Amino acid sequence: SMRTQQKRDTKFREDXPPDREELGRHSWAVLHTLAAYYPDLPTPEQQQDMAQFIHLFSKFYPXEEXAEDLRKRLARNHPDTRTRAAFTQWLXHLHNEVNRKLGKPDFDXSKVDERWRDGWKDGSXD
Amino acid sequence: SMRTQQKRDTKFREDXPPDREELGRHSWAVLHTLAAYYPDLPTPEQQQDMAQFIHLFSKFYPXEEXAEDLRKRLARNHPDTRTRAAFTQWLXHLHNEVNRKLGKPDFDXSKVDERWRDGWKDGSXD
Numbered sequence: 001s002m003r004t005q006q007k008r009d010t011k012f013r014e015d016x017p018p019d020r021e022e023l024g025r026h027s028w029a030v031l032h033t034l035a036a037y038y039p040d041l042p043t044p045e046q047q048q049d050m051a052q053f054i055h056l057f058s059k060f061y062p063x064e065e066x067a068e069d070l071r072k073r074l075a076r077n078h079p080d081t082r083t084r085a086a087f088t089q090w091l092x093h094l095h096n097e098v099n100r101k102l103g104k105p106d107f108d109x110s111k112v113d114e115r116w117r118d119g120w121k122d123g124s125x126d
Numbered sequence: 127s128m129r130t131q132q133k134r135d136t137k138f139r140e141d142x143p144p145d146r147e148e149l150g151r152h153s154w155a156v157l158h159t160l161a162a163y164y165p166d167l168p169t170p171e172q173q174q175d176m177a178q179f180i181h182l183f184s185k186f187y188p189x190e191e192x193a194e195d196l197r198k199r200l201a202r203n204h205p206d207t208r209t210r211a212a213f214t215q216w217l218x219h220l221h222n223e224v225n226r227k228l229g230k231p232d233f234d235x236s237k238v239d240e241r242w243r244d245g246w247k248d249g250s251x252d
């Protein structure tokens with residue numbers, strides 16, 4: 001017909017303020033990448049710090065409906081920051097809660113180390 | 127000649143682990159966007175929380191040379207979290223320190239509200 005609601009076909013300037021979706025994509029990348037490299041045997045101070053980091057992220061996330069949704073989840077399901085394995089998985093399952101809320105499919109949590117740190121075992125990241 | 131070191135011409139799969147540069151781009155977007163919507167008159171608890179959030183981000187940032195560089199800066203130049211105006215500018219000038227370290231030009235701090243929240247006044251984000 002003429003205009004389109006597919007943003008990629010419309011708004012071409014990259015250096016603009018992130019919208020709700022684009023901030024989401026950046027933020028999941030930041031959180032999953034921070035978790036991917038977290039210690040396998042973190043100190044007690046690290047475990048405390050990472051839980052506080054996720055709590056503070058929930059206080060300041062600037063999409064208010066998204067931040068409320070996050071604060072509700074963290075109240076029902078505190079972050080497991082005991083180890084890399086536990087925290088990476090914990091964060092995957094949380095991300096999946098949001099995906100299911102929004103009508104998106106589940107990400108296979110078995111893929112989190114490939115996806116965010118190591119690259120796919122088939123070599124498609126090289 | 128044949129291979130290229132311009133990543134865009136080589137590695138086409140998007141769902142791969144962020145490298146140092148790509149994590150940087152995501153992270154500056156997250157930090158500048160969080161600052162852009164921070165209160166103009168934050169409570170004392172908010173001011174304390176935002177400073178602690180930036181400190182914790184420096185503890186967990188997974189590029190070790192980058193995290194060390196950040197920890198050094200925050201020791202010399204604590205975040206000003208007193209107001210949106212102060213914190214957005216504080217974070218711009220910090221980002222500029224990193225840009226100059228890496229041979230990149232200064233971003234004009236007068237542009238931070240346009241860039242990260244409001245869109246350019248000429249309408250090029252619409």
Ligand SMILES: Cc1cc2nc3c(=O)[nH]c(=O)nc-3n(C[C@H](O)[C@H](O)[C@H](O)COP(=O)(O)OP(=O)(O)OC[C@H]3O[C@@H](n4cnc5c(N)ncnc54)[C@H](O)[C@@H]3O)c2cc1C
Binds near residue numbers: 023024066141
């Ligand atoms: C904490 C948080 C709360 C949010 N709350 C809301 C909200 O309440 N309402 C709303 O409209 N939007 C919310 N958003 C934005 C939303 O989650 C999506 O980021 C946005 O809709 C863009 O979706 P996307 O399809 O690009 O993929 P995203 O969900 O942004 O995912 C980005 C990439 O991460 C990978 N991935 C997907 N799922 C997982 C997983 N479970 N584990 C590991 N990797 C995964 C995939 O490679 C994917 O392409 C929130 C985002 C954040 C960060």
Ligand SMILES: Cc1cc2nc3c(=O)[nH]c(=O)nc-3n(C[C@H](O)[C@H](O)[C@H](O)COP(=O)(O)OP(=O)(O)OC[C@H]3O[C@@H](n4cnc5c(N)ncnc54)[C@H](O)[C@@H]3O)c2cc1C
Binds near residue numbers: 151218232238
């Ligand atoms: C906290 C932190 C520390 C880092 N330390 C290092 C390091 O020690 N060594 C290293 O090699 N890399 C480091 N990086 C990565 C580096 O800063 C860049 O992110 C990366 O090199 C990609 O650069 P870029 O050209 O894509 O633009 P980036 O610097 O990633 O900037 C992204 C976008 O932000 C906007 N912008 C640029 N400057 C400002 C500013 N001053 N204020 C507001 N908006 C701005 C521009 O629109 C720009 O395109 C760090 C990143 C972070 C987040």
